[PDB]
Structure formats: C-alpha cells, structure tokens
Design a protein around this ligand. Structure first.
Ligand SMILES: Nc1ncnc2c1ncn2[C@@H]1O[C@H](COP(=O)(O)O)[C@@H](O)[C@H]1O
Length: 199
C-alpha cells in the first residue's frame, strides 16, 4: 500500500517525497482513509507509530485552502509536542499555497494571520478562546493528540471546555496510547460513531 493508494493527492504526495517517507505505517494505512471519508477516528497508538501524519495528512487535504481562518485545531499535552506537530503540519503542507500553521503554548500576531491550522496546549488555547483571539467558528477538524496524557497532566477540564465550544459540524480524531475510562467518556460525549483503530 502506497500513500497514493490511501487517496492522497499530488501536493501532499510531493511533501512526503521531500520528507523521505517511502511507505505508510500501519496506523497511517488504517486511519487516513477513514478521516478522508469524513469519519471520526479513535486511534490507539503511541509516538513512533506515525500517528502525526495519520491525522494530519487527511485533515490537511480536506480543508478549504482559501478560507483564512482556523479549520483544524490540535490539542497536545506539552509545549514540545505542540511545536513538533506544528512543524510536521508545516512540512506536510509545503506544497499547499497559502496554508499556514500556528503553535500556541508572538501569539497574537500568529492568530491575526488567519492560519488554517492551530496547534496548542489546552490551557493556552483556552486563554485565546476566551479572549476571542482564537476563532473556532469555521472549525472543520479537531484532534486530541495524546488524550490520556492530557488527562494525566490534569488538563481534561480545559480539554472538555474547548470541545464544548466547537461548532456542531466537524470531524474529530482522538489519539491515545492507553484508554482511561475518562477518555472513553470523552469519546462518547464528543465523537460521532467513531472508527476504532487499534492494530
Ligand atoms: N511513513 C513514514 N515513513 C518514514 N518515517 C515516518 C513515517 N511516518 C512518520 N515517520 C517518522 O516517524 C517518527 C514518529 O512519528 P510520530 O509517531 O507521528 O511521532 C517521526 O520522526 C516521523 O517523521
């Protein structure tokens, strides 16, 4: 199975070639078609599996590149992962003109540029959400990257608050290496008939 076999088109395929990705990882082969098809996905995988591209590639391909406003919001537990994911998203979109990524963990002028992808930690995202500097009215895709870690670090209240402010019509991808009950409950509250992927 190739990346083109998963339904990815030339701009993303070219970025993958620039990055030296030769073939999809298992989590990518399983998750990418579901997300391209507009499903919610519960992905059980950890760093090293390729989970970042698994959620990033399909949601990038699915956005409106001419809409200069946040369409993909990615929640991460740490400044380090937020920055890493934003860098990856920037690399995957290298051949998508006018598509821009912001990491929030300087922040004001980031959001004023109308980035289509915003990656951040829950506390800092929730600050800009309350301030109105973060517009989620046009959001199409929500990712929780390491939901179990956000729970464990004490951030789940803020995660829930963010998730309850998102407009009805959106895709959700939730990635978690483990499955605490509180994450099961988040899946039931906030996701629509999710495809569960554990290999
Ligand atoms: N399909 C792939 N082929 C080669 N390297 C990859 C692939 N997908 C992800 N990677 C790399 O694998 C590492 C783990 O990614 P992640 O699991 O998303 O943190 C990162 O260094 C990625 O650049």
């Amino acid at each position: 199975t190739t990346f083109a076999d998963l339904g990815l088109k030339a701009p993303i395929l070219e970025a993958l070639n620039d990055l030296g990705y030769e073939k999809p990882s298992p989590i990518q082969a399983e998750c990418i078609p579901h997300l391209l098809n507009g499903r919610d996905v519960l992905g059980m995988a950890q760093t090293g599996s390729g989970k970042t591209a698994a959620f990033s590639l399909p949601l990038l391909q699915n956005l409106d590149p001419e809409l200069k406003a946040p369409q993909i919001l990615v929640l991460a537990p740490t400044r380090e992962l937020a920055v890493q994911v934003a860098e990856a998203m920037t690399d995957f979109s290298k051949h998508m003109r006018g598509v821009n990524v912001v990491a929030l963990y300087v922040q004001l002028r980031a959001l004023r540029q109308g980035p289509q992808i915003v990656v951040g930690t829950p506390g800092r995202l929730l600050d800009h959400l309350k301030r109105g500097t973060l517009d989620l009215s046009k959001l199409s895709g929500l990712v929780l990257d390491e939901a179990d870690e956000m729970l464990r670090m004490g951030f789940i209240e803020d995660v829930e608050t963010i998730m309850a402010q998102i407009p009805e019509g959106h895709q959700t991808a939730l990635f978690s290496a483990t499955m605490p009950e509180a994450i099961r409950r988040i899946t039931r509250r906030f996701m629509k008939e999710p495809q569960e992927v554990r290999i």
